[PDB]
Amino acid sequence: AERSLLTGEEGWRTYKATGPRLSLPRLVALLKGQGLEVGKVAEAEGGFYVDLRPEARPEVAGLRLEPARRVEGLLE
RNA sequence: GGGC
């Protein structure tokens, strides 16, 4: 009863990540460093969308994270 | 499906 906005797959919640010196590998490193499991990541004009577990409550210093309402500005 |  909870699906990724990037994939369709159940068990994910899509977040928008923004911040300075952002890049895919660094983003993935910061998250996994907090012991979070990381699903699909996709780059957008204003940052990255990243899938996380719905029960996870992610706090990562240096980044702003918020549940994505709409997915927009994907580089594709 | 990815480790500054």
Author numbering: 424 to 499
Passage from the reporting paper:
Hera consists of a helicase core, followed by a bipartite C-terminal extension that contains a dimerization domain (DD) and an RNA-binding domain (RBD).
Crystals of Hera_RBD (residues 424-510) in complex with a tetranucleotide were obtained and the structure of the complex was determined to 2.3 Å resolution. The tetranucleotide must have been generated in situ by partial hydrolysis of the 19mer RNA. The only GGGPyr element present in the 19mer RNA is a GGGC stretch, and GGGC was therefore modeled into the electron density. The RBD core adopts a similar structure in the RNA-free and RNA-bound form, in agreement with the secondary structure information from NMR. In the RBD/RNA complex structure, the C-terminal tail is visible up to aa 499, whereas the remainder appears to be disordered. Residues 492-499 pack closely to the RBD without engaging in contacts with the bound RNA. The 5′-guanine (Gua1) of the GGGPyr sequence is base-specifically bound by the N-terminal subdomain of Hera_RBD, a small addendum of 12 residues (A424-W435) unique to Hera. The second nucleotide, Gua2, binds through three hydrogen bonds of the Watson–Crick face to main-chain amide groups (V461, G462 and V464).
